[PDB]
Amino acid sequence: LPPDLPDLDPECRELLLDFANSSAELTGCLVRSARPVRLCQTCYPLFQQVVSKMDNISRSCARSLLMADRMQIVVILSEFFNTTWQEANCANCLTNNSEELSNSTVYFLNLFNHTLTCFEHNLQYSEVCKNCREAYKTLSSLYSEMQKMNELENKAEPGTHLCIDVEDAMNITRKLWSRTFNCSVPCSDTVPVIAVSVFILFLPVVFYLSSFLHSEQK
Amino acid sequence: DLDPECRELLLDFANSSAELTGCLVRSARPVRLCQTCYPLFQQVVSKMDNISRSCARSLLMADRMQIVVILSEFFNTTWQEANCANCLTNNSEELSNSTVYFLNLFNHTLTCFEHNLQYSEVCKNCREAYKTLSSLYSEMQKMNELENKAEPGTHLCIDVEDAMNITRKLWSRTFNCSVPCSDTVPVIAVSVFILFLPVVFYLSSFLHSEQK
Amino acid sequence: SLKYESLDYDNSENQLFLEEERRINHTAFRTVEIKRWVICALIGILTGLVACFIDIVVENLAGLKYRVIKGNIDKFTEKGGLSFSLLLWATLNAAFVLVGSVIVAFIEPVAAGSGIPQIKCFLNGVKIPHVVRLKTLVIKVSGVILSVVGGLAVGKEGPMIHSGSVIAAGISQGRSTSLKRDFKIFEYFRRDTEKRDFVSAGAAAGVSAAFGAPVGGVLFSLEEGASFWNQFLTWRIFFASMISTFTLNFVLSIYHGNMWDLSSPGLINFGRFDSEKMAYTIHEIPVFIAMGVVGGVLGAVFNALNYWLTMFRIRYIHRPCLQVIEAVLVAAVTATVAFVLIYSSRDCQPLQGGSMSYPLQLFCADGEYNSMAAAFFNTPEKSVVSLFHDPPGSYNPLTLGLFTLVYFFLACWTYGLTVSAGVFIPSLLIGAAWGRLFGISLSYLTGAAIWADPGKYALMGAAAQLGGIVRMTLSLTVIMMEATSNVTYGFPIMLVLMTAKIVGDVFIEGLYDMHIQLQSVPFLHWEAPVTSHSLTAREVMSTPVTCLRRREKVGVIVDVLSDTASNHNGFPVVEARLQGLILRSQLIVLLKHKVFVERRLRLKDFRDAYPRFPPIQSIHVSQDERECTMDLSEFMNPSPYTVPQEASLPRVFKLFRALGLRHLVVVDNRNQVVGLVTRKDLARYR
Amino acid sequence: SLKYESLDYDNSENQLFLEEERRINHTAFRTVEIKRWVICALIGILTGLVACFIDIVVENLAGLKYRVIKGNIDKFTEKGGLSFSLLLWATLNAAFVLVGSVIVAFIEPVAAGSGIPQIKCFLNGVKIPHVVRLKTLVIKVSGVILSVVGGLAVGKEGPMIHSGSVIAAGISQGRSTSLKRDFKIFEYFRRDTEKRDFVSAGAAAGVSAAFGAPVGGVLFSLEEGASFWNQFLTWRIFFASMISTFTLNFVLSIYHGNMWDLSSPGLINFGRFDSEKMAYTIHEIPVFIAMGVVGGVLGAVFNALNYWLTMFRIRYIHRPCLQVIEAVLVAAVTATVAFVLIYSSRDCQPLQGGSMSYPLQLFCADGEYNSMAAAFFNTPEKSVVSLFHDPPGSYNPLTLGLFTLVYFFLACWTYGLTVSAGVFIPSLLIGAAWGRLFGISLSYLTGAAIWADPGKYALMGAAAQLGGIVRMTLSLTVIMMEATSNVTYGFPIMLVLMTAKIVGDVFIEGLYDMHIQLQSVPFLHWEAPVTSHSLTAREVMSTPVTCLRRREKVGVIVDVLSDTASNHNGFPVVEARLQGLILRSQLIVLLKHKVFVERRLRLKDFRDAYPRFPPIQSIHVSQDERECTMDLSEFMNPSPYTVPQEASLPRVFKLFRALGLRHLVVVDNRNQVVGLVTRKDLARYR
Ligand SMILES: CCCCCCCC(=O)OC[C@H](COP(=O)(O)O[C@H]1[C@H](O)[C@@H](OP(=O)(O)O)[C@H](O)[C@@H](O)[C@H]1OP(=O)(O)O)OC(=O)CCCCCCC
Ligand SMILES: CCCCCCCC(=O)OC[C@H](COP(=O)(O)O[C@H]1[C@H](O)[C@@H](OP(=O)(O)O)[C@H](O)[C@@H](O)[C@H]1OP(=O)(O)O)OC(=O)CCCCCCC
Ligand SMILES: CC(C)CCC[C@@H](C)[C@H]1CC[C@H]2[C@@H]3CC=C4C[C@@H](OC(=O)CCC(=O)O)CC[C@]4(C)[C@H]3CC[C@]12C
Ligand SMILES: CC(C)CCC[C@@H](C)[C@H]1CC[C@H]2[C@@H]3CC=C4C[C@@H](OC(=O)CCC(=O)O)CC[C@]4(C)[C@H]3CC[C@]12C
Ligand SMILES: Nc1ncnc2c1ncn2[C@@H]1O[C@H](COP(=O)(O)OP(=O)(O)OP(=O)(O)O)[C@@H](O)[C@H]1O
Ligand SMILES: Nc1ncnc2c1ncn2[C@@H]1O[C@H](COP(=O)(O)OP(=O)(O)OP(=O)(O)O)[C@@H](O)[C@H]1O
Ligand SMILES: [Cl-]
Ligand SMILES: [Cl-]
Ligand SMILES: [Cl-]
Ligand SMILES: [Cl-]
Ligand SMILES: [Cl-]
Ligand SMILES: [Cl-]
Ligand SMILES: [Mg+2]
Ligand SMILES: [Mg+2]
């Protein structure tokens, strides 16, 4: 028999084995970076390796390895990695060179670390909410600014997610800041809001009653 | 970060999914998925179920990009699409006898092709080996309908389906061994006679009303 | 032509009717309107169940037939003797059609065809004999099953309209004349006014069951009735259409097991067009218009060949024995041509998930199945759906082109056979076939552009060919819209249907109108012809008029009714100053009960003889009774609709058609009867 | 009541009309019907473009307003001073409504409300002054934009029906009376018969643009016209509806960038119900019926409170200055109640992608928006869509319950304001709200069973509440069917709409019929009331009748027309033997041109004064001319529709309504005029 159907063609055996460990290393790195998420800052070497190896395996082995059967493992695995990469939306957090993290991304993690270490020495949560607020506000302001840059430089769609690692890092701070540290900002607007609202809601009562009483006698 | 006693089920799931992904690629062009790494798939499933059994809340739905959940979903989707459940028995611990029966007939048929390779000899030496492999493939295609109450007969174990296709492409596209009997002359005569009937019926009806 | 009698749709508001309505309103709650809704619900349920019965039986019987044929072909493919498989296929086709043709040709010829022209005539107000008899329904349902299982190039969706009408016309009466069983219910509705309203609900229920288009069913009945807007009737008609398509969906879901999946609203289910592939641009609009031109031209050719064939069959194949033989021969030829195309087909493809119900491997590689075999072994509904929803490159143009050319002539040849069978689906299949071929050509000419999706053009071709053949525009467009479940597709579908009718009307009339004309039925169109607006009621009316005095001698009434030179059924009552209108059926009842000036008759007594009134010859009157006088004051229609002598024909035609009139009295300025207008007076203008 | 004049829908087939039709056919090609299709196409295009203009302007203006309000709230959330944000929201709401109310209250009061009752009256055949004027359209379009941007609990879909009608009634005439610009085209269509037909196409085009329901638009116009079936008119009406929804879809797609995505057939787009969650069983049918009972009861309460409020406003708030103040106060209160609910709402959740454009964080954790703010900041169309399509745990019952209770009273309070605004969407939003709450309760009572999907019950609640308020059944059901793009949902939607109308009709009439009655409009229903068969034409006709001789003295004609005790517009022509009918407008034209027995008038001369005929006071006749005689033979309607004295009321009512008559002459046995029937004679029976 020809060495294509029953057994591997030698020129395609090492290319498939190249995809085997490269996809194995990407899968291993994806899981280890899952919680807390560091996906597209730690798995970005292992992901471009998979894409390049698939590119190198597909344009005499592309015909026999991609569409050679019903269950195209190589194609669907590349589809899964591409879907995971795009759903994480870290193409917007990497430069056009894509060789490393962008300056905006690197700026976010280090002051996220600055905020996290600022939280650390203020425990020993009254102290944490007192002085470690400006660090939190600039972290929150940068997140909105980075979101705005995604809405102009990328101009994709309102509400578009950033890279998951940046979004996760912001979430951990928010859960720490608002659910455990219980840093809350009191508001004294209740009385002025009640007075203004009550006055406005009393206007239709006066208008309808005065219109009724005016027509009661000419 | 999670506790060190909690970031070990995650680490166990990492290399287990890495090794499952490793086999899935090197067993892809010649499909041996359900026979090479049916343990490595069950290793991922069992180690994932261990998390479900104090790490489930902090590792499965603790963020937007549930990597552990979607990776388990991908393996389950790949397992179900490959129909590897049919490729084993009910307990899902080893290959079923029918799959092993088909696999060795697959080996026997391919062994027959090598023996008669050195395409005239191949077609007329182990032809009955091809028919019994083809007949068996139709047999398991039929009991698959009744065993799991499937509506059509669409896809068996992908390794079995790939193996049958390998034989069919060899038996039909590489070598021209098939020969169905074409009764062209009897078909033409019967078809021409039938197609000539409406001409007679309409003409005779026309020629009968004429002259009354 | 003169043997067709019009319905008595315009209720005669005589004295007896007024007393009955007064009596009903004083009998506590009035349940007449409620009973109308109950009957309409029953009409929808039974019409849906009939569609369920046809779908289930055809699926099981055609499945058994094709399994036998496939097994025989498989056995003889390699061992030899495939000519026996051809003979078995032809014999099986002949055997089923033999039974189907015999019951139509020998027992009830009115069950031949789809029955849509018969129902169109019934809602037009003219009665074709035996349309709504129980025997007609049984043969129509049995015949269409045998026709479809018999392998004829036909569809089962069309006959559903006739089947629903018969159920409506029988259930609403609460009795069975054929079975001589009278259930003492629904006696109030035993009149032509109620029956035609219920039949419209039944016909609408048939459309909804056939295509899953409840709104399309309503507009079909509204188009055919062409009456004054009746809000409560239209609401009831929609009530029956909604229940009919729901009953078919619910029962089929139970039969298929998944009770939670209501995915079968109709006998044919077009599928989902909610995809990016199923989207069109404004630049495709001129292309769609061109497709409607093709549909109109091909539809005209289809109708022209069928007209020539129908004339030949009327002249030479009118005997029932020859009709049965012709249908049997068509069934054998249909299998033979299919077998020859399958035998010589050199194109096969690997089996998809559900592309072929009975995948036939014949002379090509293992794992591949003959593509042309799928075109003939699959039900035409499945072929239409696949043509609508298939990825580009799914069809080889040669095998699809050969099937389209053959199926076009087979469907044209098969229509008009003495079998119960529809033409909707075959016309849809033909159009979806060459529509897909048009999409394939466009993809070849535009480098497989995304807008040139063959599946989308299959939908336009199916609409264009169906519009080119039956010339349905408003009901058809809504039916297509509901079937595709895509409102935006209405705009191209409307455009292709408009040009298909316009181009088709240039050459020949529609298939349904063609066969109504060939039967010499006095069919009234929506309006008078444009070349007859200069005419008035004086030119179209019939004069002199046979009238009866308000107090008329019995001998005069008998002599008028017993006259054999004419068979008038309406007589103006004069004092020749018009006083009212009396029907022949009313006079027979009065003579039978001997209501003479010398207990009192009620409106129920006139409904007791409905609808089979005895002839005047059955009435025995003595010479002494011939000198008696009969007072028609309490029984005549006291306010018949009248038009002046100088009233224009369009005004006369519009009033006659909208009110469903049978007799329209023409009077001068002194209210003297000068003429009478019936449907034959208006239908003679073309 | 006596100031409303009926349309002259029934064309007078006088001698002049016959010659004009004869001359038109004398030409090589008759282009009258082609021009009808061109006008209908233009009606659909312009109606779609108006819907595009409203949608684009509202989206941009409301986006600017909510960005300003959100930015102000965000600034004052932490630093304090949120009472200024409430004042800014109320002031912005007041400012837009101030302009919207002023242009309605002071410039064109007929533009108030949705305009559907006015269009319903116009298709009923009765003319409300200034309905189809250019100024009315400008105020209606501008008013609805300011009303929606003004934050009122209103919708913009309803006014589209009125806007389409005005375009239809003006474009078809080929001229602008308001702008004093006469384009020398479409002069043939300057008559009431053509105008009402085009307005029906315009009203249908408005429905299709508003809801993406072209078939629902056709049935709306068919319901309101309630005329004899006109196949070619209905085909043209569907032509306009199809183009209107396509033009809106095509232009919006260009505005949104994705030209190849036609995902916006209407102003409101319900979405897709083609999912397993959106499936129902037969066990839910009694549950759906119970929802219609709730919709009927709540709709009756909504209509009862609005009737009491409308009576109060008519009595005390009838001055234009007070009307403007009332609308401004409602706008400020609407913002204030929304702010209070938002301020005190403790329910907030994370941003789950899209679902809004202005997520408001107020007093809870970062990364979370206030949930109640989304209910008010989102457009009501988008809130309805979210309620239809949301996971079963998307809504807090308390947050949704408080919004439903408040929005119910806000919508009821706002409907009768002197602003251009619709009630369709607010009724849909109310029903979708408590319908979703019903689904949440069912999920709680059945352990989150898969059949108890809250989104499905939101659709049923929206239909039940809308049916309970406006009492639309057949057009509404098809509109819901087309909007959901699912025929199988027609069966539950039909059932809930039936019981919603039945339960609602027990307590009070529908909102549109309620306001028509309060305006004392002579509105004709579909049929005469239950006390109809006991009445005859004699008891309902007006007698004695002011008639004119065929050759009548000019002085007699002037005195009849100049009489101030009555303002009759139709006069039977006698010789009192009926010969025809002549209109007051025709007589004025004859007097103006001084056509006396002692150059010849054409039908164009009568259309030249249409539709603003000069009064009789403008006619100056001398004593010498008063003795001259006028021959009415060539100008009268030679065949007016007549009924006998003893003709029953249902027969009289059916003929009058179906033909769109204005005058129905009652004659005795000798064709002597004994009475006259107009719409006021028939509408007085309840
Ligand atoms: C799976 C579902 C299967 C569907 C089951 C029903 C099938 C069916 O409907 O069959 C038609 C049958 C009448 O069929 P018949 O042939 O018996 O009666 C003809 C007559 O023949 C004509 O007379 P014609 O105008 O040609 O001279 C006349 O025009 C016609 O209106 C009929 O007259 P009615 O006797 O009804 O008054 O309905 C009945 O059985 C009703 C019985 C019980 C009704 C009470 C229920 C509440
Ligand atoms: C294209 C070929 C044709 C050339 C265009 C004709 C010009 C035109 O259409 O003019 C405006 C039109 C008449 O509006 P007008 O107010 O000028 O005229 C009233 C009169 O006022 C009433 O009289 P009424 O019964 O209350 O006493 C009478 O009942 C009515 O029929 C009118 O009478 P016509 O003058 O049309 O004969 O309406 C509109 O908005 C159209 C919107 C324009 C498009 C909207 C942008 C998207
Ligand atoms: C033609 C292929 C592509 C499609 C398969 C359909 C045929 C098997 C059918 C369709 C039309 C049929 C024909 C329609 C009309 C006639 C005329 C009929 O009468 C005459 O030819 C004599 C008429 C005379 O003498 O006036 C003989 C049968 C025939 C050819 C029929 C034979 C069977 C035909 C060819
Ligand atoms: C299923 C039903 C029986 C539940 C009863 C609930 C009652 C507590 C409510 C719900 C609906 C209410 C009705 C809704 C509408 C009306 C019409 C309303 O009539 C008018 O004021 C206008 C009359 C007119 O148009 O001339 C009088 C109150 C009434 C009967 C309401 C009275 C109180 C009702 C019956
Ligand atoms: N009473 C009558 N006197 C004179 N002519 C009549 C009378 N009734 C019908 N005609 C005319 O006789 C011709 C034949 O019609 P026919 O006798 O079949 O009418 P019919 O039975 O009353 O009605 P239909 O056939 O439409 O149900 C027509 O031209 C019709 O107008
Ligand atoms: N020519 C007439 N002679 C006598 N009574 C009439 C005449 N025309 C109308 N009436 C009656 O006078 C009453 C008032 O109607 P009105 O004068 O407004 O009628 P109109 O202007 O002809 O028609 P409409 O108001 O319906 O457009 C009604 O009862 C009507 O039937
Ligand atoms: Cl038929
Ligand atoms: Cl059919
Ligand atoms: Cl048909
Ligand atoms: Cl209004
Ligand atoms: Cl609205
Ligand atoms: Cl509204
Ligand atoms: Mg007759
Ligand atoms: Mg008036």
JSON list of N, CA and C in Angstrom, two decimals, chain B residues 83-112:
[
{"chain": "B", "resi": 83, "resn": "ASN", "atom": "N", "xyz": [-17.98, 10.02, 18.04]},
{"chain": "B", "resi": 83, "resn": "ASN", "atom": "CA", "xyz": [-18.80, 8.85, 18.36]},
{"chain": "B", "resi": 83, "resn": "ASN", "atom": "C", "xyz": [-17.96, 7.73, 18.98]},
{"chain": "B", "resi": 84, "resn": "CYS", "atom": "N", "xyz": [-17.03, 8.11, 19.85]},
{"chain": "B", "resi": 84, "resn": "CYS", "atom": "CA", "xyz": [-16.18, 7.13, 20.52]},
{"chain": "B", "resi": 84, "resn": "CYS", "atom": "C", "xyz": [-16.94, 6.28, 21.53]},
{"chain": "B", "resi": 85, "resn": "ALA", "atom": "N", "xyz": [-18.13, 6.71, 21.95]},
{"chain": "B", "resi": 85, "resn": "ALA", "atom": "CA", "xyz": [-18.93, 5.87, 22.84]},
{"chain": "B", "resi": 85, "resn": "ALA", "atom": "C", "xyz": [-19.35, 4.58, 22.16]},
{"chain": "B", "resi": 86, "resn": "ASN", "atom": "N", "xyz": [-19.75, 4.65, 20.89]},
{"chain": "B", "resi": 86, "resn": "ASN", "atom": "CA", "xyz": [-20.02, 3.44, 20.12]},
{"chain": "B", "resi": 86, "resn": "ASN", "atom": "C", "xyz": [-18.76, 2.61, 19.93]},
{"chain": "B", "resi": 87, "resn": "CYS", "atom": "N", "xyz": [-17.59, 3.25, 19.97]},
{"chain": "B", "resi": 87, "resn": "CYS", "atom": "CA", "xyz": [-16.34, 2.56, 19.67]},
{"chain": "B", "resi": 87, "resn": "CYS", "atom": "C", "xyz": [-15.89, 1.67, 20.81]},
{"chain": "B", "resi": 88, "resn": "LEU", "atom": "N", "xyz": [-16.47, 1.84, 22.00]},
{"chain": "B", "resi": 88, "resn": "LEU", "atom": "CA", "xyz": [-16.24, 1.00, 23.16]},
{"chain": "B", "resi": 88, "resn": "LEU", "atom": "C", "xyz": [-17.56, 0.36, 23.58]},
{"chain": "B", "resi": 89, "resn": "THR", "atom": "N", "xyz": [-17.52, -0.38, 24.69]},
{"chain": "B", "resi": 89, "resn": "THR", "atom": "CA", "xyz": [-18.72, -1.01, 25.22]},
{"chain": "B", "resi": 89, "resn": "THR", "atom": "C", "xyz": [-19.42, -0.06, 26.20]},
{"chain": "B", "resi": 90, "resn": "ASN", "atom": "N", "xyz": [-20.43, -0.59, 26.90]},
{"chain": "B", "resi": 90, "resn": "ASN", "atom": "CA", "xyz": [-21.26, 0.25, 27.75]},
{"chain": "B", "resi": 90, "resn": "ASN", "atom": "C", "xyz": [-20.47, 0.84, 28.92]},
{"chain": "B", "resi": 91, "resn": "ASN", "atom": "N", "xyz": [-19.62, 0.03, 29.56]},
{"chain": "B", "resi": 91, "resn": "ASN", "atom": "CA", "xyz": [-18.88, 0.51, 30.72]},
{"chain": "B", "resi": 91, "resn": "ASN", "atom": "C", "xyz": [-17.77, 1.49, 30.34]},
{"chain": "B", "resi": 92, "resn": "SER", "atom": "N", "xyz": [-17.39, 1.53, 29.06]},
{"chain": "B", "resi": 92, "resn": "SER", "atom": "CA", "xyz": [-16.37, 2.45, 28.55]},
{"chain": "B", "resi": 92, "resn": "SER", "atom": "C", "xyz": [-15.04, 2.27, 29.29]},
{"chain": "B", "resi": 93, "resn": "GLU", "atom": "N", "xyz": [-14.52, 1.04, 29.23]},
{"chain": "B", "resi": 93, "resn": "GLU", "atom": "CA", "xyz": [-13.23, 0.70, 29.82]},
{"chain": "B", "resi": 93, "resn": "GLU", "atom": "C", "xyz": [-12.25, 0.09, 28.83]},
{"chain": "B", "resi": 94, "resn": "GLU", "atom": "N", "xyz": [-12.72, -0.48, 27.73]},
{"chain": "B", "resi": 94, "resn": "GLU", "atom": "CA", "xyz": [-11.85, -1.02, 26.70]},
{"chain": "B", "resi": 94, "resn": "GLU", "atom": "C", "xyz": [-12.64, -1.14, 25.40]},
{"chain": "B", "resi": 95, "resn": "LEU", "atom": "N", "xyz": [-11.93, -1.41, 24.31]},
{"chain": "B", "resi": 95, "resn": "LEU", "atom": "CA", "xyz": [-12.57, -1.56, 23.01]},
{"chain": "B", "resi": 95, "resn": "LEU", "atom": "C", "xyz": [-13.55, -2.72, 23.02]},
{"chain": "B", "resi": 96, "resn": "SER", "atom": "N", "xyz": [-14.68, -2.53, 22.36]},
{"chain": "B", "resi": 96, "resn": "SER", "atom": "CA", "xyz": [-15.67, -3.59, 22.24]},
{"chain": "B", "resi": 96, "resn": "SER", "atom": "C", "xyz": [-15.17, -4.67, 21.27]},
{"chain": "B", "resi": 97, "resn": "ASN", "atom": "N", "xyz": [-15.80, -5.84, 21.35]},
{"chain": "B", "resi": 97, "resn": "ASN", "atom": "CA", "xyz": [-15.37, -6.96, 20.51]},
{"chain": "B", "resi": 97, "resn": "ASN", "atom": "C", "xyz": [-15.61, -6.66, 19.04]},
{"chain": "B", "resi": 98, "resn": "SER", "atom": "N", "xyz": [-16.72, -6.00, 18.71]},
{"chain": "B", "resi": 98, "resn": "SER", "atom": "CA", "xyz": [-17.01, -5.69, 17.31]},
{"chain": "B", "resi": 98, "resn": "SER", "atom": "C", "xyz": [-15.96, -4.75, 16.72]},
{"chain": "B", "resi": 99, "resn": "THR", "atom": "N", "xyz": [-15.55, -3.74, 17.49]},
{"chain": "B", "resi": 99, "resn": "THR", "atom": "CA", "xyz": [-14.50, -2.84, 17.02]},
{"chain": "B", "resi": 99, "resn": "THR", "atom": "C", "xyz": [-13.19, -3.58, 16.83]},
{"chain": "B", "resi": 100, "resn": "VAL", "atom": "N", "xyz": [-12.84, -4.46, 17.77]},
{"chain": "B", "resi": 100, "resn": "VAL", "atom": "CA", "xyz": [-11.64, -5.29, 17.61]},
{"chain": "B", "resi": 100, "resn": "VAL", "atom": "C", "xyz": [-11.81, -6.25, 16.44]},
{"chain": "B", "resi": 101, "resn": "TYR", "atom": "N", "xyz": [-13.02, -6.79, 16.28]},
{"chain": "B", "resi": 101, "resn": "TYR", "atom": "CA", "xyz": [-13.29, -7.67, 15.14]},
{"chain": "B", "resi": 101, "resn": "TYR", "atom": "C", "xyz": [-13.10, -6.93, 13.82]},
{"chain": "B", "resi": 102, "resn": "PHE", "atom": "N", "xyz": [-13.63, -5.70, 13.73]},
{"chain": "B", "resi": 102, "resn": "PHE", "atom": "CA", "xyz": [-13.44, -4.90, 12.53]},
{"chain": "B", "resi": 102, "resn": "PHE", "atom": "C", "xyz": [-11.98, -4.50, 12.34]},
{"chain": "B", "resi": 103, "resn": "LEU", "atom": "N", "xyz": [-11.29, -4.17, 13.44]},
{"chain": "B", "resi": 103, "resn": "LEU", "atom": "CA", "xyz": [-9.92, -3.69, 13.34]},
{"chain": "B", "resi": 103, "resn": "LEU", "atom": "C", "xyz": [-8.99, -4.77, 12.78]},
{"chain": "B", "resi": 104, "resn": "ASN", "atom": "N", "xyz": [-9.15, -6.02, 13.22]},
{"chain": "B", "resi": 104, "resn": "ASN", "atom": "CA", "xyz": [-8.27, -7.07, 12.72]},
{"chain": "B", "resi": 104, "resn": "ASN", "atom": "C", "xyz": [-8.65, -7.49, 11.30]},
{"chain": "B", "resi": 105, "resn": "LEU", "atom": "N", "xyz": [-9.94, -7.47, 10.95]},
{"chain": "B", "resi": 105, "resn": "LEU", "atom": "CA", "xyz": [-10.32, -7.61, 9.55]},
{"chain": "B", "resi": 105, "resn": "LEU", "atom": "C", "xyz": [-9.76, -6.47, 8.71]},
{"chain": "B", "resi": 106, "resn": "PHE", "atom": "N", "xyz": [-9.77, -5.25, 9.26]},
{"chain": "B", "resi": 106, "resn": "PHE", "atom": "CA", "xyz": [-9.07, -4.15, 8.60]},
{"chain": "B", "resi": 106, "resn": "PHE", "atom": "C", "xyz": [-7.60, -4.48, 8.42]},
{"chain": "B", "resi": 107, "resn": "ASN", "atom": "N", "xyz": [-6.96, -5.00, 9.46]},
{"chain": "B", "resi": 107, "resn": "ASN", "atom": "CA", "xyz": [-5.56, -5.42, 9.34]},
{"chain": "B", "resi": 107, "resn": "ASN", "atom": "C", "xyz": [-5.43, -6.59, 8.36]},
{"chain": "B", "resi": 108, "resn": "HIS", "atom": "N", "xyz": [-6.35, -7.55, 8.42]},
{"chain": "B", "resi": 108, "resn": "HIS", "atom": "CA", "xyz": [-6.29, -8.69, 7.51]},
{"chain": "B", "resi": 108, "resn": "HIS", "atom": "C", "xyz": [-6.46, -8.26, 6.06]},
{"chain": "B", "resi": 109, "resn": "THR", "atom": "N", "xyz": [-7.41, -7.36, 5.79]},
{"chain": "B", "resi": 109, "resn": "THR", "atom": "CA", "xyz": [-7.61, -6.89, 4.43]},
{"chain": "B", "resi": 109, "resn": "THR", "atom": "C", "xyz": [-6.39, -6.14, 3.92]},
{"chain": "B", "resi": 110, "resn": "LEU", "atom": "N", "xyz": [-5.82, -5.26, 4.74]},
{"chain": "B", "resi": 110, "resn": "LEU", "atom": "CA", "xyz": [-4.60, -4.56, 4.35]},
{"chain": "B", "resi": 110, "resn": "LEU", "atom": "C", "xyz": [-3.44, -5.53, 4.20]},
{"chain": "B", "resi": 111, "resn": "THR", "atom": "N", "xyz": [-3.41, -6.58, 5.01]},
{"chain": "B", "resi": 111, "resn": "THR", "atom": "CA", "xyz": [-2.40, -7.62, 4.84]},
{"chain": "B", "resi": 111, "resn": "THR", "atom": "C", "xyz": [-2.59, -8.35, 3.51]},
{"chain": "B", "resi": 112, "resn": "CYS", "atom": "N", "xyz": [-3.85, -8.59, 3.13]},
{"chain": "B", "resi": 112, "resn": "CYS", "atom": "CA", "xyz": [-4.12, -9.22, 1.84]},
{"chain": "B", "resi": 112, "resn": "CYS", "atom": "C", "xyz": [-3.63, -8.35, 0.68]}
]
